[PDB]
Ligand binder design. Structure first.
Ligand code: NAP
Length: 215
């Protein structure tokens, strides 16, 4: 027989970079929740019902260290998972160190995350797979790349990547609007339908190892 694969592949940030980014994500959620322009849009954010504390709202958080997922394999059950694992480049890079560039932080009524911009070599570790779900269109590859920081209670694993994909798809169409504020890290935007994106002024470099997760 052949040996079974991980739940997923990806970069797994260092203790430091996880701690460094996790705290940075949590400062953002308070700055946002405590922002007037934000408090103006709770009607589009939730359904019913006062000021909301986003850090408890996104109550489902990463147990330990943060990670950027490349290919979710589900132990071989997922499509293209098989071809993706035998790629030479995936085998070349398994165990190698990497640095990732976080260009922005976002929030929607479902997820909080951090956009990841992959380099050209890192993009080679991105699955150029056949069966793109509606969102992938239009955006350069690797755009889906992110790190999950939080999810609302009843939200499913895939949504974080889709939330970012929907947002970028809108910036694509030029519906960003103008920056409605200058958060301490950078520029803020309201995209409607309870969507937001902060474009960091100095992009955050985190160090990580490309490996697989089983658990
Ligand atoms: N013994 C245990 O059971 C144990 C112990 C410790 C921790 N855990 C946690 O339990 C989790 C198990 O995974 P899960 O049930 O949360 O999600 P999952 O479906 O098992 O997938 C795991 C990861 O893959 C990504 N993913 C999930 N669905 C996807 C899809 N349709 N397309 C692309 N990527 C997808 C997500 O990463 P992104 O959101 O980053 O894209 C997610 O964090 C692990 O993440 C681990 O942290 C479990």
């Amino acid at each position: 027989e052949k040996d079974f694969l991980p739940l997923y592949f990806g970069w797994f940030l260092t203790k430091k970079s996880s701690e460094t980014l996790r705290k940075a994500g949590q400062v953002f959620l308070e700055e946002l929740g405590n922002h007037k322009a934000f408090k103006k849009e709770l009607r589009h954010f939730i359904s019913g019902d006062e000021k909301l504390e986003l850090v408890s709202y996104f109550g489902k958080r990463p147990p330990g260290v943060l990670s950027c997922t490349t290919k979710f394999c589900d132990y071989g059950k997922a499509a293209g998972a098989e071809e993706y694992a035998q790629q030479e480049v995936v085998k070349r890079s398994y165990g190698k160190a990497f640095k990732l560039s976080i260009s922005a932080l976002f929030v929607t009524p479902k997820t909080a995350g951090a956009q990841v911009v992959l380099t050209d070599q890192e993009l080679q570790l991105w699955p150029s797979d056949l069966d793109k779900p509606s969102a992938s269109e239009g955006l350069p590859p690797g755009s889906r790349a992110h790190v999950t920081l939080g999810c609302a209670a009843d939200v499913q694993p895939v949504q974080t990547g889709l939330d970012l994909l929907d947002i970028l798809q809108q910036v694509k169409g030029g519906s960003q609007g103008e920056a409605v504020g200058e958060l301490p890290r950078g520029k803020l935007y309201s995209l409607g339908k309870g969507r937001w994106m902060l474009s960091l002024t100095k992009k955050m470099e985190v160090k990580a190892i490309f490996t697989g997760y089983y658990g």
